Amino acid sequence: IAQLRPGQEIDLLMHCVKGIGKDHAKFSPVATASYRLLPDITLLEPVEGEAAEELSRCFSPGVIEVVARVANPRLDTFSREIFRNEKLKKVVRLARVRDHYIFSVESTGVLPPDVLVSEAIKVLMGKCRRFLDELDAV
């Protein structure tokens, strides 16, 4: 919190309140709560004969198998190194699936992340039932 030298005091009470994260970012329950679409990489042409290990170092390390097989696409960070090669850029189209993403919630530690998400869905449902009861009044 702070550093001191001898003869110095810190005396303070605190008050904690329940706050939305959009009020101030110190109320934010999550470090990063981003998501990303799962990539899928299709070799249109079969690649073999030392161009496979060329395509190995081109991508992310774990993504590929060595002929060339796209072993596990989920680990791919989009460096987009293929287009530097000038030969394999015509070979493989890289793509990301639209309706298949990858969430990555990392909580600060207030609530465990499996209860952050199930609370996050729970207040979106509450945000629309708040409006559906407005139409029932009118």
Partner: protein, 1044 residues
């Protein structure tokens, strides 16, 4: 060939930055006070010639302060900064004379030599430049003025080839300008003591050379154009029968407003004469020689007067005023220390009042240089160091003679677009020296003068005439042997390293300059195509087994001024060495200053974008010193969490800027977002500002002092007026604390009282209230006596401001920008790994400004944080893009940095990739809380009854006369009556019909008849025009008419 940069951190330890201010003052203390006593001994009087006062020496001791009779205690410089004193030391059988202020880190200041552990008990920051006097509490620098050279034959073009030498008397009493004009083909010698432009052959016959054969032999023996000296003047001399030497003093003896043998010594002064005028004639003849053979802004001509040269202009005059008043006393009381101790007021309040009010008002030297001193700008660290290396002028365009001496890009814009320069890194202003061994080697190496026939010094090629400091010292047949032998001698070390021999072959004059004040710079000597550093030397300097001054005596590094750079073949790098290289270049990033040089990749930006930053680098908002909490200064801006930059240069390490940085480095993502970033504006996010991105700390300062009067009554600080309870006023005396001074650690609203300073008329209280707009917390309250011990009390007001809409950020490339919008974090284009940006920057700042150096900082920074490394982007070097780009690939990033983001608002991925990375954004001191202003109706000025000027005085902003024409051109008539009579000066006046004049109220005093008096409606400023016109004899007699 590999490592030669190491000479620069060894040069900076010796005499590089803010050490030229110090050495110049250390020369002034340790030499110049003992060269004024030799000029001003022997105080004698005429009313008694049998006594004598004779000064032996002056010593200037250590800084002290007395608060009583004989305490005589010493002082740290950060006590004079608090108690508003002046950091000064006594001047001294062995009795005191006065007190003179000492610049910090000088030879007699306290701060020199002492370790950072001892800087704590002296409460001073170790990363603090020095070179500033502490006068009356504030800290003033003497700015480096640049003057033109002394006794210089300048050939200008007034009408046709006029030449004037602005001789400066070594006996410093006067400075005269003996210019030479041409009127209708004839030369003249216009002066300010001569009532007539007298022909020059009149002077020559007055100077002892009487015959006319000698004069042409002086001017031109080879005739081709110097024959056209003939029918110009020596015929015009002969046209009136006036061949005589005594008779031609007589024509001078009339116009000079036998008596002119003496008054020809106040003409072309520094050519010396012992009534042997032969040396004077050649110097006038060479001045004519230029004209018949025929650059004011070129830096061999510009000498620099530093802080120690400029104080010696003062102290010599203040010693003389102390000296002559001893004669005025000894001639008063004889028909002696005890009538001298009250003249301790003379030097002390003379020297101090010249620094605080920046006025050398010296009638003895007829100079009135205004604004020589400036208060230090403690806005950031480099805004202090950017003031220490500053040059004020007395042209605006950049000359290439400023290469290596001054920063090309560090300048203001506005009134001073090229008139306030900044010193570069590896420069050195020179000091004076003796001219003994210079002459002694000149006369051995070969020179001869006053015995040579007039004809010799002429168009013949082998007549290079040696000039030292502007005085001819003979002629040499072979220029090369002289220039080369002196240069070998200087390198060997027999002659002073600073002296420079330069040769102009257009007019055969070699120029030995030992001037002092010349801009100088070091280079690595190139004898044949192999340089002299030899690498192994660059290794000695590595262990320290050698010092930069050992390079000089080993003839490996040469100091070159601007004049010698005409004769050299400076190679920039190792690989551009030629057949005739001469000197080489130590480290080519040293041509940039210390405000630029902060910029990473300045050699990729357009050059008018570095210059914008040199202004904004001084305006940065960051940390000031390690004693930044104990300083109580009038306005101190502090950052909450500063960060050293990710892309440092090499000048940042020599300054130790990263030891006390200014500005964070935020992950920008240059893209166009939400349309609130159009004109250089830039979107921030409301999470980083909630996480503490650039929280401000603006520290004001309010003070008061409680003086004891001549009435022997004094000021009181009586406590709060509790009303109906112990509770203090409704909010007015709520923070007072019962000792008077407010309590530290408490908030002050508007119009709340800090102290109850009560004044004797009987006591009227003058309560010192805090105005502000927002609230401020007291941090410290200091209590002390000043010099005249009167209980000064100083407050210190915290205020933290998160940067909201309006607060100007810059971007370390001169692309400044008000923060137009603050979006929430969840509305912002996060990339794949989760990183939402902090500062979305508009990409239209790039293709017109062409600041490509910014685009590499997002690359060199982003590769830098991912590797755990600080990438050097210096000037002319640093980390290239072809190796930074292959470092992003190892961490799985795009090799240009353009990262695939998905949009925050819509959730779909963005159509194009977005550049992304950390660049060093420095907040700077233009926050909108200091500039928000509105004036409904407030104070009016007492004289003209218009609203006042300033926001401190509740404002009113001048609808100027340029905006009057805009309101004219719209045709809005009833607006201008409303905007310049109704809501500015709505006055009401009474005039009378007959004799029409301003008569007060109901009737007009002239013609008391009271009947015709009819009120008008007028602006008050027009009524004040009529009433001050009528004060002089102009009488505006208004003749009214009714409204039709």
């Amino acid at each position: 060939v590999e490592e030669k940069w190491r000479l620069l951190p060894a040069f900076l330890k010796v005499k590089g930055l803010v050490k030229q201010h110090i050495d110049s003052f250390n020369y002034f203390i340790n030499v110049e006070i003992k060269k004024i006593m030799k000029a001003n001994e022997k105080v004698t009087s005429d009313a008694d010639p049998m006594w004598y006062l004779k000064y032996l020496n002056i010593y200037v001791g250590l800084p002290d302060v007395e608060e009583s009779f004989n305490v005589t205690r010493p002082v740290s410089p950060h006590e004079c900064r608090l108690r508003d004193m002046t950091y000064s030391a006594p001047i001294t059988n062995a009795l005191p004379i006065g007190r003179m202020p000492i610049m910090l880190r000088s030879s007699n200041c306290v701060l020199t030599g002492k370790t950072p552990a001892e800087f704590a008990k002296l409460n001073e920051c170790p990363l603090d430049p020095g070179g500033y006097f502490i006068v009356k509490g504030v800290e003033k620098v003497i700015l480096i003025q640049e003057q033109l050279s002394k006794n210089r034959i300048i050939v200008e073009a007034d009408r046709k080839g006029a030449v004037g030498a602005s001789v400066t008397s070594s006996t410093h009493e006067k400075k005269s300008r003996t210019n030479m004009a041409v009127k209708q083909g004839r030369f003249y010698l216009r002066h300010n003591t001569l009532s007539e432009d007298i022909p020059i052959v009149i002077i020559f016959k007055a100077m002892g050379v009487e015959s006319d054969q000698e004069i042409v032999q002086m001017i031109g023996t080879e005739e081709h154009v110097m024959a056209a000296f003939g029918p110009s003047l020596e015929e015009c001399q002969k046209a009136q029968i006036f061949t005589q030497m005594q008779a031609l003093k007589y024509i001078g003896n009339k116009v000079r407003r036998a008596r002119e043998l003496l008054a020809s010594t106040i003409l072309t002064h520094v050519p010396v004469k012992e009534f042997n005028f032969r040396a004077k004639c050649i110097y006038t003849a060479v001045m004519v020689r230029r004209v018949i053979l025929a650059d004011r802004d070129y830096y061999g001509n510009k000498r620099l007067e530093l802080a120690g040269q400029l104080l010696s202009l003062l102290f010599e005059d203040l010693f003389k005023k102390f000296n002559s008043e001893m004669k005025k006393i000894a001639d008063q009381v004889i028909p002696f220390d005890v009538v001298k101790h009250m003249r301790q007021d003379q030097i002390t309040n003379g020297m101090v009042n010249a620094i605080s009010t920046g006025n050398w008002s010296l009638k003895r030297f007829k100079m009135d240089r205004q604004g020589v001193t400036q208060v230090l700008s403690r806005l950031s660290y480099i805004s202090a160091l950017g003031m220490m290396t500053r040059i004020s002028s007395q042209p605006r365009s950049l000359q290439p003679s400023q290469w290596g001496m001054l920063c090309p890009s560090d300048t203001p814009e506005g009134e001073a677009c090229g008139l306030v320069k900044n010193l570069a890194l590896m420069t050195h202003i020179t000091t004076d020296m003796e001219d003994g061994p210079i002459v002694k080697l000149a006369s051995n190496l070969g020179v001869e003068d006053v015995n040579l026939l007039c004809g010799e010094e002429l168009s013949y090629p082998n007549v290079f005439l040696v000039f030292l400091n502007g005085n001819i010292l003979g002629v040499i047949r072979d220029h090369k042997k002289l220039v080369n032998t002196f240069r070998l001698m200087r390198r060997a070390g027999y002659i002073n390293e600073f002296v420079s021999i330069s040769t102009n072959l257009t007019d055969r004059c070699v120029y030995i300059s030992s001037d002092g004040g010349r801009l100088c710079r070091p280079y690595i000597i190139v004898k044949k195509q192999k340089p002299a550093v030899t690498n192994k030397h660059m290794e000695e300097l590595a262990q320290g087994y050698r010092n930069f001054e050992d390079f000089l005596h080993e003839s490996l590094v040469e100091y070159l001024d601007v004049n010698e750079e005409n004769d050299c073949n400076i190679a920039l790098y190792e690989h551009t060495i030629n057949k005739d290289t001469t000197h080489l270049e130590i480290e080519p990033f040293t041509l940039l200053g210390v405000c630029a040089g902060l910029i990473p990749y300045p050699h990729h930006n357009q050059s008018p974008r570095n210059t914008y930053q040199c202004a904004m680098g001084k305006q940065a908002m960051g940390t000031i010193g390690y004693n930044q909490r104990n300083r109580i200064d009038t306005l101190m801006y502090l950052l909450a969490y500063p960060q050293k930059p990710m892309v440092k240069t090499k000048t940042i390490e020599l300054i130790e800027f990263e030891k006390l940085p200014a500005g964070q480095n935020a992950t920008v993502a240059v893209m166009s977002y939400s349309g609130y970033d159009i004109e250089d504006a830039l979107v921030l996010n409301k999470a980083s500002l909630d996480r503490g991105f650039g929280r401000c700390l603006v520290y004001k300062n309010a003070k008061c002092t409680l003086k004891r009067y001549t009435n022997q009554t004094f000021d009181k600080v009586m406590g709060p007026m509790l009303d109906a309870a112990t509770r203090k006023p409704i909010w007015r005396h709520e923070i007072l604390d019962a000792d008077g001074i407010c309590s530290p650690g408490e908030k002050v609203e508007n119009k709340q009282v800090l102290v109850n300073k009560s004044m004797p008329t009987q006591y009227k209280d003058v309560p010192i209230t805090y105005k502000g707009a927002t609230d401020s917390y007291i941090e410290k309250v200091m209590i002390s006596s000043n010099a005249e011990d009167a209980f000064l009390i100083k407050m210190l007001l915290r205020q933290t401001r998160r940067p909201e809409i309006g607060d100007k950020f810059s971007s370390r490339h001169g692309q400044k920008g008000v923060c137009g919008l603050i979006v929430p974090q969840e509305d912002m284009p996060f990339c794949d790994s989760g990183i939402c940006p902090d500062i979305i920057m508009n990409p239209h700042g790039f293709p017109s400004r062409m600041t490509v150096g910014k685009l590499i900082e997002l690359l060199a920074g982003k590769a830098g944080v991912l590797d755990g490394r600080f990438h050097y982007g210096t000037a002319f070097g640093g980390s290239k893009v072809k190796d930074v780009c292959e470092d992003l690939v190892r961490h799985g990033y795009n090799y240009l940095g353009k990262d695939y983001v998905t949009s925050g608002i819509t959730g779909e991925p963005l159509e194009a990739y977005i550049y992304f990375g950390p660049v060093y954004y420095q907040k700077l001191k233009h926050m909108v809380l200091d500039k928000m202003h509105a004036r409904a109706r407030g104070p009016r000025a007492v004289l003209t009854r218009q609203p006042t000027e300033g926001r401190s005085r509740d404002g009113g902003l001048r609808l100027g006369e340029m905006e009057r024409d805009c309101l004219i051109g719209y045709g809005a008539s009833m607006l201008l009556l409303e905007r310049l009579m109704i809501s500015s000066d709505a006055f009401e006046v009474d005039v009378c019909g007959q004799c029409g004049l301003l008569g007060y109220s109901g009737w007009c005093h002239y013609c008391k008849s009271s009947c015709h008096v009819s009120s008008l409606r007028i602006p008050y400023a027009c009524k004040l025009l009529f009433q001050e016109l009528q004060s002089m004899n102009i009488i505006p007699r208004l003749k009214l008419s009714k409204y039709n």
